[PDB]
Design a protein around this nucleic acid. Structure first.
Ligand SMILES: [K+]
Ligand SMILES: [K+]
Ligand SMILES: [K+]
Ligand SMILES: [K+]
Ligand SMILES: [K+]
Ligand SMILES: [K+]
Ligand SMILES: [K+]
Ligand SMILES: [K+]
Ligand SMILES: [K+]
Ligand SMILES: [K+]
Ligand SMILES: [K+]
Ligand SMILES: [K+]
Ligand SMILES: [K+]
Ligand SMILES: [K+]
Ligand SMILES: [K+]
Ligand SMILES: [K+]
Ligand SMILES: [K+]
Ligand SMILES: [K+]
Ligand SMILES: [K+]
Ligand SMILES: [K+]
Ligand SMILES: [K+]
Ligand SMILES: [K+]
Ligand SMILES: [K+]
Ligand SMILES: [K+]
Ligand SMILES: [K+]
Ligand SMILES: [K+]
Ligand SMILES: [K+]
Ligand SMILES: [K+]
Ligand SMILES: [K+]
Ligand SMILES: [K+]
Ligand SMILES: [K+]
Ligand SMILES: [K+]
Ligand SMILES: [K+]
Ligand SMILES: [K+]
Ligand SMILES: [K+]
Ligand SMILES: [K+]
Ligand SMILES: [K+]
Ligand SMILES: [K+]
Ligand SMILES: [K+]
Ligand SMILES: [K+]
Ligand SMILES: [K+]
Ligand SMILES: [K+]
Ligand SMILES: [K+]
Ligand SMILES: [K+]
Ligand SMILES: [K+]
Ligand SMILES: [K+]
Ligand SMILES: [K+]
Ligand SMILES: [K+]
Ligand SMILES: [K+]
Ligand SMILES: [K+]
Ligand SMILES: [K+]
Ligand SMILES: [K+]
Ligand SMILES: [K+]
Ligand SMILES: [K+]
Ligand SMILES: [K+]
Ligand SMILES: [K+]
Ligand SMILES: [Mg+2]
Ligand SMILES: [Mg+2]
Ligand SMILES: [Mg+2]
Ligand SMILES: [Mg+2]
Ligand SMILES: [Mg+2]
Ligand SMILES: [Mg+2]
Ligand SMILES: [Mg+2]
Ligand SMILES: [Mg+2]
Ligand SMILES: [Mg+2]
Ligand SMILES: [Mg+2]
Ligand SMILES: [Mg+2]
Ligand SMILES: [Mg+2]
Ligand SMILES: [Mg+2]
Ligand SMILES: [Mg+2]
Ligand SMILES: [Mg+2]
Ligand SMILES: [Mg+2]
Ligand SMILES: [Mg+2]
Ligand SMILES: [Mg+2]
Ligand SMILES: [Mg+2]
Ligand SMILES: [Mg+2]
Ligand SMILES: [Mg+2]
Ligand SMILES: [Mg+2]
Ligand SMILES: [Mg+2]
Ligand SMILES: [Mg+2]
Ligand SMILES: [Mg+2]
Ligand SMILES: [Mg+2]
Ligand SMILES: [Mg+2]
Ligand SMILES: [Mg+2]
Ligand SMILES: [Mg+2]
Ligand SMILES: [Mg+2]
Ligand SMILES: [Mg+2]
Ligand SMILES: [Mg+2]
Ligand SMILES: [Mg+2]
Ligand SMILES: [Mg+2]
Ligand SMILES: [Mg+2]
Ligand SMILES: [Mg+2]
Ligand SMILES: [Mg+2]
Ligand SMILES: [Mg+2]
Ligand SMILES: [Mg+2]
Ligand SMILES: [Mg+2]
Ligand SMILES: [Mg+2]
Ligand SMILES: [Mg+2]
Ligand SMILES: [Mg+2]
Ligand SMILES: [Mg+2]
Ligand SMILES: [Mg+2]
Ligand SMILES: [Mg+2]
Ligand SMILES: [Mg+2]
Ligand SMILES: [Mg+2]
Ligand SMILES: [Mg+2]
Ligand SMILES: [Mg+2]
Ligand SMILES: [Mg+2]
Ligand SMILES: [Mg+2]
Ligand SMILES: [Mg+2]
Ligand SMILES: [Mg+2]
Ligand SMILES: [Mg+2]
Ligand SMILES: [Mg+2]
Ligand SMILES: [Mg+2]
Ligand SMILES: [Mg+2]
Ligand SMILES: [Mg+2]
Ligand SMILES: [Mg+2]
Ligand SMILES: [Mg+2]
Ligand SMILES: [Mg+2]
Ligand SMILES: [Mg+2]
Ligand SMILES: [Mg+2]
Ligand SMILES: [Mg+2]
Ligand SMILES: [Mg+2]
Ligand SMILES: [Mg+2]
Ligand SMILES: [Mg+2]
Ligand SMILES: [Mg+2]
Ligand SMILES: [Mg+2]
Ligand SMILES: [Mg+2]
Ligand SMILES: [Mg+2]
Ligand SMILES: [Mg+2]
Ligand SMILES: [Mg+2]
Ligand SMILES: [Mg+2]
Ligand SMILES: [Mg+2]
Ligand SMILES: [Mg+2]
Ligand SMILES: [Mg+2]
Ligand SMILES: [Mg+2]
Ligand SMILES: [Mg+2]
Ligand SMILES: [Mg+2]
Ligand SMILES: [Mg+2]
Ligand SMILES: [Mg+2]
Ligand SMILES: [Mg+2]
Ligand SMILES: [Mg+2]
Ligand SMILES: [Mg+2]
Ligand SMILES: [Mg+2]
Ligand SMILES: [Mg+2]
Ligand SMILES: [Mg+2]
Ligand SMILES: [Mg+2]
Ligand SMILES: [Mg+2]
Ligand SMILES: [Mg+2]
Ligand SMILES: [Mg+2]
Ligand SMILES: [Mg+2]
Ligand SMILES: [Mg+2]
Ligand SMILES: [Mg+2]
Ligand SMILES: [Mg+2]
Ligand SMILES: [Mg+2]
Ligand SMILES: [Mg+2]
Ligand SMILES: [Mg+2]
Ligand SMILES: [Mg+2]
Ligand SMILES: [Mg+2]
Ligand SMILES: [Mg+2]
Ligand SMILES: [Mg+2]
Ligand SMILES: [Mg+2]
Ligand SMILES: [Mg+2]
Ligand SMILES: [Mg+2]
Ligand SMILES: [Mg+2]
Ligand SMILES: [Mg+2]
Ligand SMILES: [Mg+2]
Ligand SMILES: [Mg+2]
Ligand SMILES: [Mg+2]
Ligand SMILES: [Mg+2]
Ligand SMILES: [Mg+2]
Ligand SMILES: [Mg+2]
Ligand SMILES: [Mg+2]
Ligand SMILES: [Mg+2]
Ligand SMILES: [Mg+2]
Ligand SMILES: [Mg+2]
Ligand SMILES: [Mg+2]
Ligand SMILES: [Mg+2]
Ligand SMILES: [Mg+2]
Ligand SMILES: [Mg+2]
Ligand SMILES: [Mg+2]
Ligand SMILES: [Mg+2]
Lengths: 118, 56
RNA sequence: AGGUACUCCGGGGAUAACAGGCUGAUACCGCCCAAGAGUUCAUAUCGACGGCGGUGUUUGGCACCUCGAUGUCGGCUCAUCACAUCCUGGGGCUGAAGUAGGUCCCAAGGGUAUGGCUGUUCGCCAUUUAAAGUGGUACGCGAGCUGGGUUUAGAACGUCGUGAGACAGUUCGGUCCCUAUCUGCCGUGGGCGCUGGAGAACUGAGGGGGGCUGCUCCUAGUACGAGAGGACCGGAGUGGACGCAUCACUGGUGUUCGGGUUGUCAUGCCAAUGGCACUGCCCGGUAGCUAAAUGCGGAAGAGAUAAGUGCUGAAAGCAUCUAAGCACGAAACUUGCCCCGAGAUGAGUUCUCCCUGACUCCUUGAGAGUCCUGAAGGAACGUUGAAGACGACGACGUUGAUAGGCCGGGUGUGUAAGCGCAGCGAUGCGUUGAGCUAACCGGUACUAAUGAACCGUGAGGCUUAACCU
RNA sequence: CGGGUAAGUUCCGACCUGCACGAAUGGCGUAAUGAUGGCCAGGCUGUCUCCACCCGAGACUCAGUGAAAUUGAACUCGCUGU
RNA sequence: UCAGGUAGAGAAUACCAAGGCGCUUGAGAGAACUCGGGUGAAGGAACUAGGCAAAAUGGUGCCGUAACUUCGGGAGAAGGCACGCUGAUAUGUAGGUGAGGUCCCUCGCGGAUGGAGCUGAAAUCAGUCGAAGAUACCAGCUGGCUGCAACUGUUUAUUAAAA
RNA sequence: GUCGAGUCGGCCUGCGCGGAAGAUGUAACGGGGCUAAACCAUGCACCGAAGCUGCGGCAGCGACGCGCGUUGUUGGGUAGGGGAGCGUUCUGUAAGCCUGUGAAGGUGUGCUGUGAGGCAUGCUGGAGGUAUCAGAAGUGCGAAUGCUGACAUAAGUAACGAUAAAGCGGGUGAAAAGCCCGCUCGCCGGAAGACCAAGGGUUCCUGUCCAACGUUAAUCGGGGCAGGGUGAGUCGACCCCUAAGGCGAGGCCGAAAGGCGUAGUCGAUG
RNA sequence: CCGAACCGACUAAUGUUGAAAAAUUAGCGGAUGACUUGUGGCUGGGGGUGAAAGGCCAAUCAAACCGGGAGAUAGCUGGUU
RNA sequence: GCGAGGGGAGUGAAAAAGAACCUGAAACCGUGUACGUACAAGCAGUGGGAGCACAGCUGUGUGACUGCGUACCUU
RNA sequence: GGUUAAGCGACUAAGCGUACACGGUGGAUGCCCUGGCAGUCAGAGGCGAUGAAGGACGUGCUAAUCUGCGAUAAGCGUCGGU
C-alpha cells in the first residue's frame, strides 16, 4: 500500500533522485524550457517552483539556502536577479508542462516543461 | 513444470483473443494550424490549442 | 574359494524393501451365556469357562499395480473427513444424601497446552487447561520448507574374519533440481447473452462466514447433611483463546522533516554549505501503514427433532408413551446474525430517461441498400484517489478545488544565517522559541485538466387471450 | 548413585554386573595447540513469542529483442462406484 | 615493474590527485512473493538436531589478572580507568635537524665551538561543547567442565579437513 | 364371592423386526421413483443377439454329372503352417509403342475391382515414358529413448550478464536514452590508472558503410570494405658461456625395433 | 604472535535451463616456512606420482586417451515395412 | 534512407525461369468465402438427422439435436 | 385499432472448428551428370645424394585463391606436329 504517500521513486535510490533533480532544476532555470519524460516533469515542478518562491525575497540567508539546494552560483544569481522579479506578482504555477509524444529509443512518454513567461 | 500434451492451434488462438490492438479513437484538429494531433499533445509543427508553443 | 559401501553392464514389477490392493489369522471395538466377586444380591460396577460378530488401526499372509524411478522417519507450514466423544450440551441406571463420581444412551456446533531430555514418533518428567480425544486422508502434506535419523564414497572403536572386508552395533564428517501447459484453488478482468436502447435502486433462488469457554458475585452458607462440607434452577459481572474493523489514545516504523557529530574532498579563502563513507554514524519525528493499542462479535428468540420423559388410549374387560389422537425434549438440523448473490439461460422486479425521416432494389422477408439523422447514454482523452499488479472501481475537466504550486495554520525539530557584545581562545550571550519544516488542515484558478471528434440510432417479432375501441 | 535444571535418553563425577578395555595393529596421564566432537554459563540479540514498518533489486505495465525442458491425439469438471 | 595527497602502524581502510570509467535494453508502477539491507514496544534461546543466522566484542596507554604448567606458557586471562577541542606551562616544551660566525688544521666533501632558522612528540594544570570524543570506515565476544589428536603441517581438484 | 364366553402355552412353518459404528459427497435398487414398479404361485402376451429364418452376393471343401452345372456343407482367430496375388526399380521383347497436338513428377475430379490396386481426365509441369510375356531384386515403414533435414509447442512467456547512476543543452542524421561536443552528477584510484613478459596477430590510425555480427536502437564499434602505419652499433632476439636435462662419432648392451653412454654438441629460467 | 598482499577453503545465504560444467557475497585458516610463485626439465598406463583420499595423471581414472583385432560376445530388451 | 524491399517497363517460349532462380510434395503459418459454435461435460468418430449455403429431385459443403463408443504399438 | 398479459422466438462471434479457394514457409519427388562403384583387356611395376615423396615462399598488366612454373619463375632453346 501507499495510502496518501507523495513522491515518485523513479526506480532510483534517494541520493540519485536528489542529485538528478538538482541537475534538472538547474537546466530548467538556465534554458527556461527542457524536454524530459512526463513523470520526471511532474516531479520537477515540486523542486523548481519552491526555488522561485524562495527567490522572491532577496537576502543573504535565502541565497545561501538556494545555493544549498542547487550548488550552482550562476543558477542562484539568475533565480534572484531575474526569475524572482519576473514572478513577483504570480502566486505559484511558474511552470507549464506540454505533452509531446513518445521517445524513439524506448517509447517513453515525453513532455516539455517551461517557465510560463518564456 | 511443463505440459504433458502439446496445446492445439485452437487453444493458442483462444489465448490470443485478447491481444488485438486498439486504434486511437479519433485525432484532434488544431484550431489555428489545422494539424491533426493526439489530444492534449502538441502538434508536429509545435502548436497546442492554437498557440505556437515551441519553435520547430 | 571369497570380497566389493570403489563398483559396472544387460534385464525384471517374471521377484523383495515403501505406498496401494486382496485377506482379516493377529489386533482393536461390540455382543451372547452367566460361574462368581459385590455383607445379602449374577446383571450399580466387574464378569471366569466358552460362544457370535463388526472395523480395516496393529503384527502378518499373498505377490495383483509401479524396477525405460510411484523420494524415506521426524519436525515445520497448511489442512480435511469419520465418530468408537477428550471438553462443553441433553439424558437413563447407580452400591446417586449433597459436593464429587461410576456406567450406558444421544450428540461432530465449536474448542481441544507450553516446556526439559532425545533425530525421534512415542515416552518419562515440570508446569498449565473446560479439555490437552481416537482414527482416516500415499502411516495427509519435500514440483511447499527442513534434512537431525535411516541409507553411498572418508575415518575409528568393540566384535567377526588368515584376509579383502563385515555388523536393523556404536562413533565424528558428509551437494535436497524444476520459469506451471492442463485439472484444481484464491483473486481479478474481457466477450456475448438476458429480445428497442439507456441510467439507477432492488427482490433473493442459491452459496459462504460465524457457533469455544473460565473465574468471581448474587440466589445461599439456603436445599442436602450427624458433621465435614455444600448444590440444582435462575441472574449479574469480569477474563482466556479466536475473529472483524479502526488509528482517537499508548507505541513501532518513518533512507521524502529537523538537529548533533567523525574522516575527507570541493564550492578561491574566512564564515557558511554540498558530495562520499551502510541513511557514514547517531538523536528525535509528520502523514501513511501498523500491534503490543481499543472498539465490537459468538447470542437471545423461533421451527422441527435425538436419546429420554409423558398424557389420553384400545388391540389384550387389566396393564400399556402408540396402534388412532395429544404434549415436552440438546451447542447437532431449519431459521434468526454477517457477507456474496439474477450467467437464478428458470437470465426476475421497480423507478426514471431517449429515439415519432426519405427512398430504392429483390429471390418477398424478423430481406438488402442509399440518402438524411446521431438521442438518452457510453467510451476515449486529460487532472487524479486511504481504489489498484494490469484491467476494474471512485472523484474531477474552466458553468472547475481533480492534481501540483501558492497563501495561512498545524506538526516536528529545538534558539538558523548575518550582525553585535563578553572572552587570549574553544565557546557563551543577545537579536530569537529563532530558522527550516514530507505525505496533514483550511483556503486560493497561478499551472494543467481544449472547442471538438468517436461509439450508440430513428418507436422496437409472431401467436393467443383480456380489456377497450 | 551423586551433581547441574521447575523438569536433563545428552553432559560431568562415581560404582563395576568390562554382552564384547588393556599395555608400541601400544596402556594410563598430560601443559600448550585445534575453522575438531559433547555439555554449561554471562553478554547479546527478529532465532523465537509474533510479527510491523521502511530502503533498494526483481516480480507487474509499456516499447525493442527473444530462449527452454516437455509433447500419441484432445471438445483436458466434481463425487461414488467399476 | 611503477607507488602522489589528508587521516592512518600500514601496500589495511575512508575521501581524493594524475589518469580512467557509469559496466550495450530502456520507460513507468510502487500488489503478493523472492532476493540484498535498515529499525523495532515488552520479553530474551522460550527457536532449533544444534544459538544455524543475526546481534555483540573490537583501538592505544595505564592499573590489574586464577587454577594448572613441560616454567616457555596459560595471558590481550578476566576486570577496569583515561581519550574531543581551547589556553597555559613553553609567543613551540623534551627531542631531532642545523646556517652564519669563531677557532684549529697534516687546508679539506676537514675537526672543534657555537647555536640562527626549520621541524616537533608526550605530559600536566585550567577551561569548554555534545546524548555520545578509540564518534565514520576500520577493529578480539568472554568464562567453566569434558572426549580425541602432542604440537606447525597434509588430504578425498568438484558433497568428507577430521579423531 | 362377583363378572358371562372364550382362554392359556407349547410344537411346526411363511414373511418381516432388533442385533447393525468410518473416514472427499447422497453413495449397500445404476438413477428417478415404487406399497407394488416388492415377494410367492399359476397362466397368456410381448421386447430382446452379429443365434435361427427370409432375400441378394462371394469364397473353401466334397459329391454328382458334363472348366461348367447341380448338390451338400463350411468360411471368429494369436503363435504358426499352407495357398494365391498387388505394386515399385532394373534386363530382354524394344532402332518397337506413347510423347512438344505435352513424358515423368505434382495437385484435383469421375469411374472401377474382394483387397493390395487399376483406368480416364481438368489444372500444374516442360522431356521423357513404356504395353505384353518373361527375368532380377538395395521391392513396400508409424513405432526400434531409430538416423538426417525441416517445422511446431511452451510463448511473444523467462531473460537482456554485477544495484558505480544518471540529467540537460547543442550537433549530425531518415531516425538519437546509448554516437560527437559542452556543463553538471556519480564510480575506481596498491586500480576499474600507467608499463612489460607470455599468449594473440592487424584487433592499431584514417576514410567510408549499417545487410549480418553487437543480447535493444545505432548515425557508433574490437563488425564490412578501402587506404595508411612498426625506421636502432647502444632496447630485445640472434650471438659468446654454461644449469637441470637432451642428443651423442667410436663404444658397451639388447631377438629386431632399440637401451645407456664417452669425446663432444645442444639447452635459459642464470 | 596480530595482520594486508599471496596461498588456502571451515560456516551460511544466493545461484542450481547459473554471470560460473564448482562461482559470488558476508564471515574463516596459513601468512620466514614441511611457505609461495615464474620459466624450463624428468617420470607413461598394471605404468607413473601419491604427508595415502584409490587421490591425481588435460572438465575422463578400482587401470588415461587415440587407432586397430572389431560387425568381440549378448540363452537379454527393443524393432521387423 | 543516393537503403532493404517492391511496383511498372523491357528481355525471353516461359520471370509464381530474376539469380533466396527446373520441378516445387508434406509438416507448419496465413488471407478470403460457406456453414457450425458463447446452458455446454469425456479417444472427438460412427449410425440416425433438422436447418442453411451451393451446383444441377439429386450431387457437394456444413452439422443443431440424438443411439452407440475409454487411441495405437509393445509386453 | 390500441394497450396490457401470457407463450414462443430469429439477427451477436471476442474468438474457435470443418470444407474450399489463393498464398507463405520448406526442399520431398521426377528428370539430369565433367562424380563415384565393380570389372575386362593391355601397359607400367618404382622414385631418391644428378637431392625424392611431401612441403614453405615466391612468380602475371594482378588484390586473392586455383592451375602451371622457379629469381631464365602461366615460362627459355631446339627438333618435329599443327
Ligand atoms: K569374484
Ligand atoms: K567399505
Ligand atoms: K473380520
Ligand atoms: K473382512
Ligand atoms: K456388536
Ligand atoms: K520400482
Ligand atoms: K487429522
Ligand atoms: K458431555
Ligand atoms: K450420568
Ligand atoms: K463436535
Ligand atoms: K534435542
Ligand atoms: K523412545
Ligand atoms: K507413499
Ligand atoms: K526436497
Ligand atoms: K516427508
Ligand atoms: K508430485
Ligand atoms: K488435465
Ligand atoms: K455453517
Ligand atoms: K496510532
Ligand atoms: K506514527
Ligand atoms: K563534510
Ligand atoms: K396409559
Ligand atoms: K436479470
Ligand atoms: K490545489
Ligand atoms: K541564538
Ligand atoms: K543567530
Ligand atoms: K518552531
Ligand atoms: K603392529
Ligand atoms: K606413551
Ligand atoms: K580443526
Ligand atoms: K575441546
Ligand atoms: K576508499
Ligand atoms: K505495478
Ligand atoms: K627545538
Ligand atoms: K582486535
Ligand atoms: K597419548
Ligand atoms: K581443517
Ligand atoms: K458352395
Ligand atoms: K491424376
Ligand atoms: K500430368
Ligand atoms: K521414429
Ligand atoms: K511462440
Ligand atoms: K551477449
Ligand atoms: K532501442
Ligand atoms: K623455487
Ligand atoms: K596409484
Ligand atoms: K585429453
Ligand atoms: K591400463
Ligand atoms: K518454370
Ligand atoms: K517456393
Ligand atoms: K453423436
Ligand atoms: K512399444
Ligand atoms: K515388459
Ligand atoms: K463466427
Ligand atoms: K509446406
Ligand atoms: K601459385
Ligand atoms: Mg496526496
Ligand atoms: Mg526497471
Ligand atoms: Mg550515501
Ligand atoms: Mg504421461
Ligand atoms: Mg495475451
Ligand atoms: Mg568406508
Ligand atoms: Mg543397471
Ligand atoms: Mg506391501
Ligand atoms: Mg498390509
Ligand atoms: Mg507382480
Ligand atoms: Mg501366482
Ligand atoms: Mg500402485
Ligand atoms: Mg515412465
Ligand atoms: Mg510421482
Ligand atoms: Mg455416537
Ligand atoms: Mg454436520
Ligand atoms: Mg445451529
Ligand atoms: Mg538449556
Ligand atoms: Mg537438545
Ligand atoms: Mg506420509
Ligand atoms: Mg494424521
Ligand atoms: Mg508432494
Ligand atoms: Mg519448491
Ligand atoms: Mg543427516
Ligand atoms: Mg565437515
Ligand atoms: Mg526443494
Ligand atoms: Mg462480466
Ligand atoms: Mg458453513
Ligand atoms: Mg492521526
Ligand atoms: Mg514514537
Ligand atoms: Mg529514525
Ligand atoms: Mg571553514
Ligand atoms: Mg566526490
Ligand atoms: Mg569515491
Ligand atoms: Mg436455541
Ligand atoms: Mg386403558
Ligand atoms: Mg456456548
Ligand atoms: Mg479490482
Ligand atoms: Mg514547535
Ligand atoms: Mg545548521
Ligand atoms: Mg508553512
Ligand atoms: Mg541419573
Ligand atoms: Mg540427570
Ligand atoms: Mg561418565
Ligand atoms: Mg583396542
Ligand atoms: Mg584387543
Ligand atoms: Mg607386549
Ligand atoms: Mg599386540
Ligand atoms: Mg601390541
Ligand atoms: Mg596411539
Ligand atoms: Mg593446523
Ligand atoms: Mg515485452
Ligand atoms: Mg596512500
Ligand atoms: Mg584499498
Ligand atoms: Mg507495484
Ligand atoms: Mg519493494
Ligand atoms: Mg527480507
Ligand atoms: Mg539490525
Ligand atoms: Mg525488540
Ligand atoms: Mg527508539
Ligand atoms: Mg527494548
Ligand atoms: Mg538479558
Ligand atoms: Mg530449547
Ligand atoms: Mg521447541
Ligand atoms: Mg554464527
Ligand atoms: Mg554481525
Ligand atoms: Mg588489540
Ligand atoms: Mg633531515
Ligand atoms: Mg564421552
Ligand atoms: Mg592434529
Ligand atoms: Mg571434496
Ligand atoms: Mg569441504
Ligand atoms: Mg435379521
Ligand atoms: Mg457422509
Ligand atoms: Mg437382429
Ligand atoms: Mg448367422
Ligand atoms: Mg443364401
Ligand atoms: Mg462363423
Ligand atoms: Mg479365418
Ligand atoms: Mg525396359
Ligand atoms: Mg524412369
Ligand atoms: Mg518391359
Ligand atoms: Mg528396403
Ligand atoms: Mg516416415
Ligand atoms: Mg509396426
Ligand atoms: Mg525425448
Ligand atoms: Mg524447440
Ligand atoms: Mg514484445
Ligand atoms: Mg506461462
Ligand atoms: Mg510473468
Ligand atoms: Mg521480466
Ligand atoms: Mg548490461
Ligand atoms: Mg541529448
Ligand atoms: Mg546508458
Ligand atoms: Mg580485420
Ligand atoms: Mg579503433
Ligand atoms: Mg573505421
Ligand atoms: Mg541490432
Ligand atoms: Mg533500422
Ligand atoms: Mg570501420
Ligand atoms: Mg574495424
Ligand atoms: Mg644417449
Ligand atoms: Mg653409434
Ligand atoms: Mg651434456
Ligand atoms: Mg653452447
Ligand atoms: Mg635468459
Ligand atoms: Mg588443497
Ligand atoms: Mg571469501
Ligand atoms: Mg595461529
Ligand atoms: Mg596471521
Ligand atoms: Mg595399452
Ligand atoms: Mg576406501
Ligand atoms: Mg581430471
Ligand atoms: Mg583391466
Ligand atoms: Mg575377431
Ligand atoms: Mg556389436
Ligand atoms: Mg532495387
Ligand atoms: Mg529444362
Ligand atoms: Mg522453383
Ligand atoms: Mg505447402
Ligand atoms: Mg442451469
Ligand atoms: Mg446455445
Ligand atoms: Mg469440456
Ligand atoms: Mg456414450
Ligand atoms: Mg475461420
Amino acid at each position: 500500500m501507499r495510502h496518501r504517500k507523495s513522491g515518485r521513486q523513479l526506480n532510483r535510490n534517494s541520493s540519485h533522485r536528489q542529485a538528478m533533480f538538482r541537475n534538472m532544476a538547474g537546466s530548467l532555470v538556465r534554458h527556461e524550457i527542457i524536454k524530459t519524460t512526463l513523470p520526471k516533469a511532474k516531479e520537477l515542478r515540486r523542486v523548481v517552483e519552491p526555488l522561485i518562491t524562495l527567490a522572491k525575497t532577496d537576502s543573504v540567508a535565502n541565497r545561501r539556502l538556494a545555493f544549498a539546494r542547487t550548488r550552482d552560483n550562476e543558477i542562484v544569481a539568475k533565480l534572484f536577479n531575474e526569475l524572482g522579479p519576473r514572478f513577483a506578482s504570480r502566486a505559484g504555477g511558474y511552470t507549464r508542462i506540454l505533452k509531446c509524444g513518445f521517445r524513439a529509443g524506448d517509447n517513453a512518454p515525453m513532455a516539455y516543461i517551461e517557465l510560463v513567461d518564456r | 513444470a511443463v505440459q504433458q500434451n502439446k496445446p492445439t492451434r485452437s487453444k493458442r488462438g483462444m489465448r490470443r483473443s485478447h491481444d488485438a490492438l486498439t486504434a486511437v479513437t479519433s485525432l484532434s484538429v488544431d484550431k489555428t494550424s489545422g494539424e491533426k494531433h493526439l489530444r492534449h499533445h502538441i502538434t508536429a509543427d509545435g502548436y497546442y490549442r492554437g498557440r505556437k508553443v515551441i519553435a520547430k
